[PDB]
Amino acid sequence: EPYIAWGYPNLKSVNELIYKRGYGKINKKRIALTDNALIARSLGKYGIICMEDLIH
Amino acid sequence: SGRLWCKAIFAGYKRGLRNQREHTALLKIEGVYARDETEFYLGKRCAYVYKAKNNTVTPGGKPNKTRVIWGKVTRAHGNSGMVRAKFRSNLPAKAIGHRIRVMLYPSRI
């Protein structure tokens, strides 16, 4: 507790975070989510195929 | 035929108490005492103008003893109308408590 602040984020908050500062762990390399191709490549086996699906 | 620059004093460098960052001057502009009265001066060109023994060149003029270090009022500094400046070379320290001319002429008026 005394080491964190936390709470229940908005929808906006989730959008802002992911778009502005969304980086995917891709072959263990922190990589920026500049195109869906990245998200799909890693998460596509879960019916997650774009940034919107990630947010969802 | 008169003065085309607002008077200001070179108060000292941007600094915490015990670390002075010599690449960022502080400017006390004359007549302006609020982080409010200072949007006029942001982005304005400003000169520290000082003469010295040996002659130099002079744009549109014969050689002179005067020299200037050009700068630029970047942003306001703390409540009471103080401003930060940034000069193409750092300011001498000799220069503290002396005139630096703030121009008008990157005007947004």
Binding site: - | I9, A11, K28, I96, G97, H98
Partner: protein, 199 residues
């Protein structure tokens, strides 16, 4: 280009701090009528506070030790010095811009002289509090020339009364002159109250 302040009615420390910053920014300051500076807290309080400062002395060779200036001007100069970096070159340079006087001598007697209203006693202290005149304090701690300074200021005040009287008489003539002339200055005077003076 030179601040002349009337030290009268001002608070010792409160004026000093304002003078100190001005002096550091290259402004040449003259403080005048320093005996009129007055310090918060009752007189006896501040006498004892001075008499303690007098006790502080370099035991083995007092001739080196802290120089206790008696004169109110020099007292003020001392407290201003306390708010500068007076060991540096810049601090010394700044102190050299300052000029301080017991009473008000001849360059400054015929100069309009300002007042710091942020250091002014009427403003800064509650009216039921007590305070000390730095003249009396200096007088009782050693200062020799209270009486002399007093007499010179009477003469100065008399000479100033005359000056004022002549200024008043001129101002009166100006007011009458405007009334004499108010049809051949009418359409100048009109424009000087469209753009908002005279009103």
């Amino acid at each position: 280009q030179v601040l002349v302040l009337d030290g009268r009615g001002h608070l010792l420390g409160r004026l000093a701090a304002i003078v100190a910053k001005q002096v550091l920014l290259g402004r040449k300051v003259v403080v005048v009528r320093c005996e009129g500076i007055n310090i918060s807290g009752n007189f006896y309080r501040n006498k004892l506070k001075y008499l303690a400062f007098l006790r502080k002395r370099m035991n083995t060779n007092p001739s080196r030790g802290p120089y206790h200036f008696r004169a109110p001007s020099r007292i003020f100069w001392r407290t201003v010095r306390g708010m500068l970096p007076h060991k540096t070159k810049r601090g010394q340079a700044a102190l050299d811009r300052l000029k301080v006087f017991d009473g008000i001598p001849p360059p400054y007697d015929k100069k309009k002289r300002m007042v710091v209203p942020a250091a002014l006693k009427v403003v800064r202290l509650k009216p039921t509090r007590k305070f000390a005149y730095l003249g009396r304090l200096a007088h009782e701690v050693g200062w020799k020339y209270q009486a002399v300074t007093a007499t010179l200021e009477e003469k100065r005040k008399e000479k100033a009364k005359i000056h004022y009287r002549k200024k008043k008489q001129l101002m009166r003539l100006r007011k009458q002159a405007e009334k004499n002339v108010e049809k051949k200055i009418d359409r100048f005077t009109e424009v000087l109250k469209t753009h908002g003076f005279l009103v």
